[PDB]
Structure formats: structure tokens, C-alpha cells
């Protein structure tokens, strides 16, 4: 279920210069492009080896788009400041996520386009790719303008067309990394915390993509509410790490098993603490 | 590739 996503950030900074526009693109959990208008001569830069297979026109054209976006989001920030009757002295941020989910037939499974203002939902393209959900009265102004401008029709064409076509292209150009799931390396540790309790921590290291399920079971019963589960974290080499811990009564450790589900595993793993 | 052109909010 591959996907392509772009994440846009535009932040106003009155007095400290023009609004800053940042764009990053992802195929699944792999970042492949970056644009930051804060550079002296801003350019789109590669963030994955396979995107460097594109020719010079690709980079020039992406830079043109993102440079234009820098100017367009400056106007959008002014518009929203007017919608909310906000002062010209405060700093505000627009965030946006959009992209396509690839179905098994090589065509669009689901399209996405969501925006936020100051960290709160603002407007979103509905699943039919033909209508919008506005969060508040201000976003209903954007909705009316985008209904008349037919923005949903533009987005639907992109999501069903170029987004799918170029995601399939990237998946091919980098299939030796993008289409190779890396299974986690796994082990279980044991730490006493009292005379009668101990910590069982189940580790998953070096896996890709980030999607994974680590669960503890006691006599085959899920221990979700009792499990400390840290956020999946990046290793720095495009792989990820995660662990799950449970505090158990001393002497029950054999009743506890760790279950690891990941795309790179031939079969789901069942792990125990082995003294 | 990104959306080729952006509308103002």
C-alpha cells in the first residue's frame, strides 16, 4: 500500500523577513526532496539516492513550483490574517499534507489534501475528491472561493493522475530500497525493579517501513493497557526503532510473550525472555 | 512531483 506525500509549512515572521516556505516529499517513510526558501538561492535538494536519477529539468521545474509556492503562501497567510481579523505583528503557520495512496491495480486507492492554521485543522478535501470540509467560519470563506475556482477538480486530476504516475515511477527507480522491507532485529531484556517485580522490554531495531506492531501477551492475552509503548523513532539510516515494556510479577516471566508483526518478517515473531 | 500550481487560501 505505497503512498506519496508532500508536507508544506509556511510561517509568517513580521519584521524578521518574508514568510518562510518549506516543502518535503515522501515515498512511504522515505524522504526524497527538500525545499527551504530561507536559503540565499533556494533550490530543491535530493534526500534519497534514487531521486538523483532525474534530469536537470526535474530539479529546475520543482524549484520553480516551490519558489512560486513561497509567494502564493505569503498571500494565503495575509488572507487568513484578514479572515480572523488578526494583527499584522503576530506569527502564524499554515501546514499542509497531500498525496495519493496506491491501490493494488496500480491506480489511486485514496487521495488526501489537508491544511491547518496555527496547528489546528482548517480545511480538508473529502474522500470523494469533489468537496471540502471546513473547520470554522473562516475556512468557509476558503471553501466558497475554492468551489468557484474548482480547486477540488484540480486536486482530483492530480491525485488520480500525476501523483499516481510519478509515485509508480519513483517506486521503480528505487525499488531496491523502496520495495524491500527490512525486518526488525529483535530481543527481550529483563530488569528487576523491586524484590517482586521486573521489567520485560521487547525491542525491534533496524526495520523499514515504520509500520510495526509490538504487543505483549500474558497467557495469550493482550496486555495493551499495561504496556509502555514508545513512539517509533528514526535510527538515522532511514530505518526505525521501537520497544514495548511491561512490569511483571517476579516468577511470571514465562507467561509473557512478545509478538512482532512487520512486513519484512516471513512469519510473525513470538519472543520470550531467555535467561 | 508536487501539485503544479497552488491556489490562495
Amino acid at each position: 500500500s505505497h503512498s506519496m506525500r508532500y508536507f508544506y509549512t509556511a510561517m509568517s515572521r513580521p519584521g524578521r523577513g518574508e514568510p518562510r516556505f518549506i516543502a518535503v516529499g515522501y515515498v512511504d517513510d522515505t524522504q526524497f526532496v527538500r525545499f527551504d526558501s530561507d536559503a540565499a538561492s533556494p533550490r530543491t535538494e535530493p534526500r534519497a539516492p534514487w531521486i538523483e536519477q532525474e534530469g536537470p529539468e526535474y530539479w529546475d521545474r520543482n524549484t520553480q513550483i516551490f519558489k512560486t509556492n513561497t509567494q502564493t503562501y505569503r498571500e494565503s497567510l495575509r488572507n487568513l490574517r484578514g479572515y480572523y481579523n488578526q494583527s499584522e505583528a503576530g506569527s502564524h503557520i499554515i501546514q499542509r499534507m497531500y498525496g495519493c495512496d496506491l491501490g493494488p491495480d496500480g491506480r489511486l486507492l485514496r487521495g488526501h489534501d489537508q491544511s491547518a492554521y496555527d496547528g489546528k485543522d482548517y480545511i480538508a478535501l473529502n474522500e470523494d475528491l469533489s468537496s471540502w470540509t471546513a473547520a470554522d467560519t473562516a475556512a468557509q470563506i476558503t471553501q466558497r472561493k475554492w468551489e468557484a475556482a474548482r480547486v477540488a477538480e484540480q486536486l482530483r486530476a492530480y491525485l488520480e493522475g500525476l501523483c499516481v504516475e510519478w509515485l509508480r515511477r519513483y517506486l521503480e527507480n528505487g525499488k531496491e530500497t523502496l520495495q524491500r522491507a527490512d525486518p526488525p532485529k529483535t530481543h527481550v531484556t529483563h530488569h528487576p525493579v523491586s524484590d517482586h517485580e521486573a521489567t520485560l522490554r521487547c525491542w525491534a531495531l533496524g526495520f523499514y517501513p515504520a509500520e510495526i506492531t509490538l504487543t505483549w501477551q500474558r497467557d495469550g492475552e493482550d496486555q495493551t493497557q499495561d504496556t509502555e509503548l514508545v513512539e517509533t523513532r528514526p535510527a538515522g539510516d532511514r530505518t526505525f526503532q521501537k520497544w514495548a515494556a511491561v512490569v511483571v510479577p517476579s516468577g511470571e516471566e514465562q507467561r509473557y510473550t512478545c509478538h512482532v508483526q512487520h512486513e519484512g518478517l516471513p512469519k510473525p515473531l513470538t519472543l520470550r525472555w531467555e535467561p | 512531483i508536487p501539485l503544479t500550481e497552488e491556489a490562495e487560501l
Partner: T-cell receptor, first 113, second 112 residues
Framework: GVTQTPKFQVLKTGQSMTLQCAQD?????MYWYRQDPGMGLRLIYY???????DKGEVPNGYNVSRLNKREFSLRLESAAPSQTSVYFC?????????????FGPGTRLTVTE | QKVTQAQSSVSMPVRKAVTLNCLYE???????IFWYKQLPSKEMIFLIR?????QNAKSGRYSVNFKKAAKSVALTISALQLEDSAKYFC???????????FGQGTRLTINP
């Protein structure tokens, strides 16, 4: 819509002339094109918004200035017979699908020796 | 050339239909084709647009036969009126900038 002045102009070779354009549609993208008789339009300069003119993208013999959001000017610095043309200004919105360009009524300009 | 309108002049009786051809060349992954008509006053009138990611355009009496692989984008005008006599231009707008590249146009004469 898009307005242009003057509608007609005759110039002697070597004279200067400034053409004026305005659009009241809240657009940002504006354009100068020229049309020689029997031909299509050819781009002179594209102004995506207010800002300083990129002189490296301005064809020889012309100066352009984006005065503000509405107003866009084109100057022939030294009129030559080859610059006899119909000069069109245009504007458009960005985003969505209704991005076709609106053309002004044009300036029909003849340069004679 | 980057936009080619091979028909220099076309005549067609009133109330019939006519197809005006247009060929283009581009390496952009995203573009629009626009059809305009020009009056003897030199006024330019927008007719119909065709996006590279869109199905065949249709707007009233105007329709576009978009053959993307062949980069052909012919305009058909049905139920012709005398007012349709004009010079018709095919224009390519590439990418974000939309710096239009025009064909040389085709003079259409509707005969009463």
C-alpha cells in the same frame, strides 16, 4: 477585466513609448505578449506578482515594471520598425482549473522611419 | 515548431461542424492547451481549455479531442453560426508559469 492604453500608437524610429495595463480581478500573474500580423502571440515578459523586474528575462528593446498588484507597464526604449506589433497584456488566477488568461484589448503599434 | 496549426484557412457552411487541428511539443509533465478566437478588432476571446491530466474537454458547442500520446488537441465547433467566423488560435501553457506558446492560427470563414 483587463484594460490597456493606448489602443493605437504610431512612433518614429528611435522614439520611446510606455504601454499601460491594469486588471481589477485580484490576479497576481500578469503577462505582456506581442502579435505580429499573420502570426500568433509571443511572450515578452511574465510577472508572477509585485516585485523587481528580472532584466535578464526582458527581451532587448523593452523595459517592464510591475507597479503594483493591478498595474503592469511595458516600455519600448527605442522604437524600431521590427517592433510594429499588437501588444497584448494578460492576467490570470492561479490554482483551480479556471486558469485561462484574460487579454486586454491590445495596443496596435506601428513604427515608421 | 512547438505549436503547429497546419490549417491556414478553413471554410464551412453555416449550421454544419468544423474541426480545427493543433499539434504541440513539450517535455513538461503538466500543461494546458487553450483555444482562443480573435476578432478583426484584435480582441481575444477564450473558448475552451484542455488539461494534460483531464478527460476530453467539452463546453457548449466547443469540444476537444485530446490525444495525449500523439500530442494532438483538435477543436471541433458544432452547429456553426456566421458569428463563428474568426481566426482561431491554439496555445500551449506549460507547467506553473503558463508562458503561452501560440500556433499561427487558422482563419475560419462560415459561409451563409
Amino acid at each position: 477585466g483587463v484594460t490597456q492604453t493606448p489602443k493605437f500608437q504610431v512612433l518614429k524610429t528611435g522614439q520611446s513609448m510606455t504601454l499601460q495595463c491594469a486588471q481589477d480581478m485580484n490576479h497576481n500573474s500578469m503577462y505582456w505578449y506581442r502579435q505580429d500580423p499573420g502570426m500568433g502571440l509571443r511572450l515578452i515578459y511574465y510577472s508572477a506578482s509585485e516585485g523587481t523586474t528580472d532584466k535578464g528575462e526582458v527581451p532587448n528593446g523593452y523595459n517592464v515594471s510591475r507597479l503594483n498588484k493591478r498595474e503592469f507597464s511595458l516600455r519600448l526604449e527605442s522604437a524600431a520598425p521590427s517592433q510594429t506589433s499588437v501588444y497584448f497584456c494578460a492576467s490570470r488566477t492561479r490554482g483551480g482549473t479556471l486558469i485561462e488568461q484574460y487579454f486586454g484589448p491590445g495596443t496596435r503599434l506601428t513604427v515608421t522611419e | 515548431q512547438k505549436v503547429t496549426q497546419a490549417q491556414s484557412s478553413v471554410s464551412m457552411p453555416v449550421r454544419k461542424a468544423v474541426t480545427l487541428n493543433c499539434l504541440y511539443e513539450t517535455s513538461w509533465w503538466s500543461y494546458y492547451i487553450f483555444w482562443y478566437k480573435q476578432l478583426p478588432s484584435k480582441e481575444m476571446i477564450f473558448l475552451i481549455r484542455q488539461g494534460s491530466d483531464e478527460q476530453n474537454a467539452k463546453s457548449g458547442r466547443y469540444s476537444v479531442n485530446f490525444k495525449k500520446a500523439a500530442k494532438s488537441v483538435a477543436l471541433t465547433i458544432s452547429a456553426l453560426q456566421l458569428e463563428d467566423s474568426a481566426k482561431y488560435f491554439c496555445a500551449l501553457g506549460e507547467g506553473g508559469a503558463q508562458k503561452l506558446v501560440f500556433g499561427q492560427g487558422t482563419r475560419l470563414t462560415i459561409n451563409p
